[PDB]
Scaffold this active site. Structure first.
Site, PDB file in Angstrom:
ATOM      1  N   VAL A 157       2.047   0.585  -6.822  1.00 39.86           N
ATOM      2  CA  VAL A 157       0.882   1.143  -6.237  1.00 39.86           C
ATOM      3  C   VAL A 157       0.258   0.447  -5.032  1.00 39.86           C
ATOM      4  O   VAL A 157       0.739  -0.506  -4.617  1.00 39.86           O
ATOM      5  CB  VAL A 157      -0.237   1.048  -7.622  1.00 39.86           C
ATOM      6  N   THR A 164      15.622  10.711  -3.546  1.00 39.51           N
ATOM      7  CA  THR A 164      15.521   9.771  -2.701  1.00 39.51           C
ATOM      8  C   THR A 164      15.847   8.467  -3.107  1.00 39.51           C
ATOM      9  O   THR A 164      16.532   7.507  -2.563  1.00 39.51           O
ATOM     10  CB  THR A 164      14.393   9.695  -1.914  1.00 39.51           C
ATOM     11  OG1 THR A 164      13.319   9.863  -2.818  1.00 39.51           O
ATOM     12  CG2 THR A 164      14.242  10.968  -1.054  1.00 39.51           C
ATOM     13  N   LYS A 220      -1.463   5.274 -13.886  1.00 43.24           N
ATOM     14  CA  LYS A 220      -1.439   4.005 -13.348  1.00 43.24           C
ATOM     15  C   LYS A 220      -2.099   2.956 -14.061  1.00 43.24           C
ATOM     16  O   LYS A 220      -1.592   1.796 -14.290  1.00 43.24           O
ATOM     17  CB  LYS A 220      -1.356   4.069 -11.679  1.00 43.24           C
ATOM     18  CG  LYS A 220      -0.173   4.654 -11.114  1.00 43.24           C
ATOM     19  CD  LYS A 220      -0.491   5.132  -9.378  1.00 43.24           C
ATOM     20  CE  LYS A 220       0.486   5.646  -8.879  1.00 43.24           C
ATOM     21  NZ  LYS A 220      -0.081   6.590  -7.904  1.00 43.24           N
ATOM     22  N   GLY A 275       5.502  -2.685  -3.612  1.00 40.03           N
ATOM     23  CA  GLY A 275       5.760  -3.838  -4.547  1.00 40.03           C
ATOM     24  C   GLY A 275       5.738  -3.407  -5.980  1.00 40.03           C
ATOM     25  O   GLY A 275       4.685  -2.712  -6.497  1.00 40.03           O
ATOM     26  N   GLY A 328       0.524  17.522   4.331  1.00 38.22           N
ATOM     27  CA  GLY A 328       1.234  17.131   3.180  1.00 38.22           C
ATOM     28  C   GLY A 328       1.051  15.992   2.361  1.00 38.22           C
ATOM     29  O   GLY A 328       1.524  15.785   1.253  1.00 38.22           O
TER      30      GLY A 328
END
Lengths: 395, 396
Positions: B130, B12, B193, B131, B175
């Site tokens: 987590v 994607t 992160k 821009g 999902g």
């Protein structure tokens, strides 16, 4: 290898003094890293006779802006003076003379930004504007004035009147002695103008922002909102629908679960909505002199790295409306159930209605999902409407 | 007029990069007097499908890209550490600029690529979220809700009063969670992160295994409701504190004061709350950047790299003009809550404040403010059964 970057400052208040000190304390790093020596060649001030700190007295101070505008050795003009007139002309002249401009002028509006940006591009020079925060934005909502927000927070948390909370805000320095610009929403309105220009690339006038301040908010409003599940904030809002920006600043009930509802005291925030992205929000205090100065210098260094406009179109997105109101009525006879039933009978279609006690012979209603304010309609049905606030963050 | 690029990967994010380049190709030529040519796109399997059939050269051989000396910039949106990282090392060594949006890179990898880039005089631009995670000097601490699924689960437990298992099943059914949700629920994604955020915030490299990590599967509705009555929400918080040259990083269930801006961050929303200097706290809130937003960042970085190359400080503002809090759950306690409270007052070292709550049959919880470390071992050595300890944040 070291080139000189010759600059001039227009103005020297707290912001200008910070720019100077920041340039001074980083001069070696700017020299030893980016192969450029920054020379503050002129500083324009209102009075060159005033008594000033020792560091400032070594720069060339002048009261004549033409000395700066006619100095063909200058690379960049930093304007921190404020004002529209004659300031804007000064900057027009600089741009026409192939000088880059960096401005932290708090009085500039979208009209002025647009006219300077174009003129800059026309002359092949940068224009950097400071106002921390940098297509597909359809709506923004913000708490854009620290003082007003501080006041509403103090009223809410400490159960004081607006007047008491304003005095306390003065005592703490959040509010000035004439706090009009804060409490009447003028500052927030200016920021809505700027934010609408940056978000939508549309120029609106300050006068196009429908504006109401916080000086009419009472503790009763706050407590009845509370009981209904809302906080009250001064919200600056812009909605871009069918080519038109609708902009406002006003007391607004915000659902307690909304991220904006938690923004208290002098903190500000800008909540951004767009297709098809999720919502975003930036939260932080209103910039101080030191932070603005800091931004000016980094922009100075960025421009110096120059030696470009404007944004992306994203119809790659293909490969993949209502309003709510809080209405306070008074001089109402009869029961809250009767008031409620009358509203159910008179309102056009809407999603939900809830009513609350407000005061003696006074009721409030939160109505979700109307096409427009029911104020006139309620007035025509024989109710005295004290006021109507918009309601946000309904799910 | 030609800027020759290659994409490594085409999910994607890659498809978005392509489509964004296509719909802005006229502007770019004007906005740079250069023509962007997507000369190769590496895909793992040419024969898979559906993102549609297009005009670009697809290849399954990365050497075709790495050996094409006509290329100016490599855009990597493939993911993986091996052999993805070696590919980028090769590109940089061959004087190719690299723009990567690789979600698996950790600080070790970012550092080695940044240095290698500078060494070869080429750009390395890294995109995250987590821009884009910069959000560029004075940061001492950050706290974040950095994983959508875990936050969604905690929000569902809290709002709808369900068990963790029920909330996890609901998250699967929608999902948000995968069938093995370990990466989400055990805090691994948040920990990654925290690594990246610590590197960007502090310029310090820590390893994924240096992040003290506990997931959410042990959080119960009792924890949530006791916390609630005490004035806290429970979130999975990723945290980095930079004190005396050392980063202390963690991911764990944390009680967060209800007034704190982080306490309001619900469902799949994320946020990073940043603490610094004399400046105020700041926070960015939003969902994880979507494919389209990341693609958008890649292209602007592409254009910035193109304008420069011709290459590429921290301002210093120096100029006039912490303890820990804990939520401790103890069980098999005999006697009253007042007695328990008095026993804690006697056994704790000096601290600012203590409050105790009923938790379950013969179980009490305590919020303790102002300790240097977890009183768990101490309370244990005094003969109490400690069930667990969660840190407590946003205390004023």
């Amino acid at each position: 290898h070291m080139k000189k970057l010759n600059i001039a400052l227009l103005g020297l208040g707290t912001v200008g003094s910070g720019v100077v000190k920041i340039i001074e304390e980083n001069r070696q790093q700017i020299q030893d890293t980016l192969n450029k020596d920054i020379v503050i060649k002129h500083i324009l001030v209102r009075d060159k006779s005033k008594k000033r700190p020792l560091n400032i007295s070594q720069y060339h101070l002048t009261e004549d802006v033409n000395e700066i505008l006619n100095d063909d050795s200058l690379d960049i003009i930093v304007e921190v003076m404020g004002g529209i007139e004659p300031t804007v002309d000064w900057l027009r002249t600089a741009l026409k003379n192939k000088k880059h401009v960096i401005t932290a002028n708090k009085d500039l509006l979208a009209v002025h930004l647009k006219l300077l940006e174009d003129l800059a591009e026309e002359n092949g020079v940068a224009l950097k504007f400071e106002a921390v925060g940098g297509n597909n934005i359809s709506k923004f909502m913000g708490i854009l004035n620290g003082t007003s927000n501080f006041i509403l927070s103090k009223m809410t948390k400490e159960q004081t009147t607006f007047e008491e909370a304003l005095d306390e805000a003065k005592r703490l320095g959040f509010a000035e002695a004439d706090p009009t610009d804060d409490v009447e929403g003028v500052d927030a309105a200016r920021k809505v103008v700027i934010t609408s220009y940056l978000s939508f690339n549309q120029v609106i006038k300050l006068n196009d922002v429908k504006r109401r301040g916080i000086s009419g908010v009472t503790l009763t409003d706050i407590n009845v909102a509370d009981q209904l599940g809302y906080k009250i904030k001064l919200i600056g809002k812009g909605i871009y629908e069918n080519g038109k920006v609708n902009a406002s600043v006003e007391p607004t009930l915000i659902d307690k679960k909304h991220q904006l509802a938690a923004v208290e005291d002098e903190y500000n925030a800008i909540y951004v909505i767009g297709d098809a992205v999720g919502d975003t929000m930036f939260y932080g205090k209103g910039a101080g002199s030191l932070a603005t100065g800091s931004a000016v210098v980094s922009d100075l260094l960025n421009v110096a790295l120059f030696f470009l406009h404007p944004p992306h179109f994203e119809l790659k997105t293909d490969k993949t409306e209502k309003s709510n109101f809080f209405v306070v009525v008074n001089h109402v006879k009869g029961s809250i159930e009767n008031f409620e039933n009358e509203l159910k009978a008179i309102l056009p279609f809407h999603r939900s209605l809830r009513v609350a006690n407000y005061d003696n012979q006074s009721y409030a209603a939160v109505i979700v999902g109307l096409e427009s304010s029911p104020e006139e309609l309620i007035t025509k049905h024989g109710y005295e409407v004290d006021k109507v606030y918009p309601v946000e963050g309904v799910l």
